[PDB]
Amino acid sequence: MINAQLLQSMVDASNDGIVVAEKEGDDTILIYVNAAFEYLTGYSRDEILYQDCRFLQGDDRDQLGRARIRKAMAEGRPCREVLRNYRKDGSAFWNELSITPVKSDFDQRTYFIGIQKDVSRQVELERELAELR
Amino acid sequence: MINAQLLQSMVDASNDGIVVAEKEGDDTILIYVNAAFEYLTGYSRDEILYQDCRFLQGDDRDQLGRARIRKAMAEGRPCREVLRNYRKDGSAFWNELSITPVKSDFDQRTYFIGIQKDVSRQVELERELAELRA
Ligand SMILES: Cc1cc2nc3c(=O)[nH]c(=O)nc-3n(C[C@H](O)[C@H](O)[C@H](O)COP(=O)(O)O)c2cc1C
Numbered sequence: 001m002i003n004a005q006l007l008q009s010m011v012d013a014s015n016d017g018i019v020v021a022e023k024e025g026d027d028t029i030l031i032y033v034n035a036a037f038e039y040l041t042g043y044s045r046d047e048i049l050y051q052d053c054r055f056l057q058g059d060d061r062d063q064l065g066r067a068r069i070r071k072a073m074a075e076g077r078p079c080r081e082v083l084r085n086y087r088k089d090g091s092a093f094w095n096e097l098s099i100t101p102v103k104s105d106f107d108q109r110t111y112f113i114g115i116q117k118d119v120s121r122q123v124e125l126e127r128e129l130a131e132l133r
Numbered sequence: 134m135i136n137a138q139l140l141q142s143m144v145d146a147s148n149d150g151i152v153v154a155e156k157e158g159d160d161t162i163l164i165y166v167n168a169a170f171e172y173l174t175g176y177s178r179d180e181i182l183y184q185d186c187r188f189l190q191g192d193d194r195d196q197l198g199r200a201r202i203r204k205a206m207a208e209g210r211p212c213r214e215v216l217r218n219y220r221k222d223g224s225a226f227w228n229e230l231s232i233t234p235v236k237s238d239f240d241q242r243t244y245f246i247g248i249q250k251d252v253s254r255q256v257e258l259e260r261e262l263a264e265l266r267a
């Protein structure tokens with residue numbers, strides 16, 4: 001059978017980054033991040049917790065994704081967007097983000113699960129198939 | 134403190150298929166699969182549970198993965214390989230699989246966490262870039 005520890009081990013085994021955030025006003029702040037997230041972003045858990053994830057956009061602040069993300073957050077609906085993001089050292093990567101609202105039965109509160117997929121290679125590839133044709 | 138329900142939701146939110154297996158003798162049986170895995174393979178959970186993953190390999194004939202996975206697992210070592218796999222309807226997809234051994238900090242029985250990611254599209258695009266850039 002399955003127990004709690006193995007669930008955690010499943011989350012730690014994950015390649016895609018996985019985070020949990022809670023909504024405070026128009027900030028959605030990080031209460032959990034896995035190791036995949038740390039290697040993808042180059043940030044440790046201890047630096048980044050209790051802050052909104054928008055910092056990964058660095059100073060690239062005009063992304064349509066942002067607006068749609070916010071709307072979905074308001075409506076308590078899942079969304080998937082592709083953003084340009086930037087690691088700690090400043091390196092750039094393409095991030096397909098999935099946000100799933102889930103209401104926790106403990107405090108009856110809605111939490112947001114992010115899942116970050118690194119799509120950078122695919123980005124540069126379809127950009128090449130398109131540009132050649 | 135984030136809780137068990139939230140962990141289960143993290144697993145159900147996953148893009149990648151996720152499975153858990155325990156070792157029986159010479160084969161590793163699934164004690165768990167998430168929904169991504171079920172819809173990816175087209176096989177439901179109760180069809181495939183408590184049996185070894187080899188059915189996903191289908192009638193495809195191939196080595197490097199099967200043997201090296203068997204070896205790494207035998208040796209309690211991680212591996213990642215890309216295999217041609219087939220859904221229930223028979224359709225083929227490219228499956229990038231990563232299998233990791235689990236450390237039992239309690240409850241001492243041996244576990245393996247597999248992750249099945251569908252890379253078929255990226256495969257097809259680079260074959261298109263390769264053929265075009267030729
Ligand atoms: C759970 C969760 C995870 C998120 N992860 C990322 C992320 O990895 N990268 C990013 O650029 N934005 C991420 N966001 C989006 C921002 O944190 C923020 O909520 C969104 O950009 C709101 O739009 P705004 O910047 O216009 O305020 C995430 C949001 C949530 C709720």
Ligand SMILES: Cc1cc2nc3c(=O)[nH]c(=O)nc-3n(C[C@H](O)[C@H](O)[C@H](O)COP(=O)(O)O)c2cc1C
Pocket residue numbers: 152153154161185186187188189190198199200202203206216218228230232233245246247248249
């Ligand atoms: C945790 C775990 C997950 C696995 N997931 C898959 C999978 O998704 N698809 C697949 O073809 N084989 C998967 N395998 C491999 C099979 O279980 C088995 O090792 C494979 O069919 C090789 O066959 P053989 O070593 O018995 O010859 C997984 C193995 C483990 C331990």
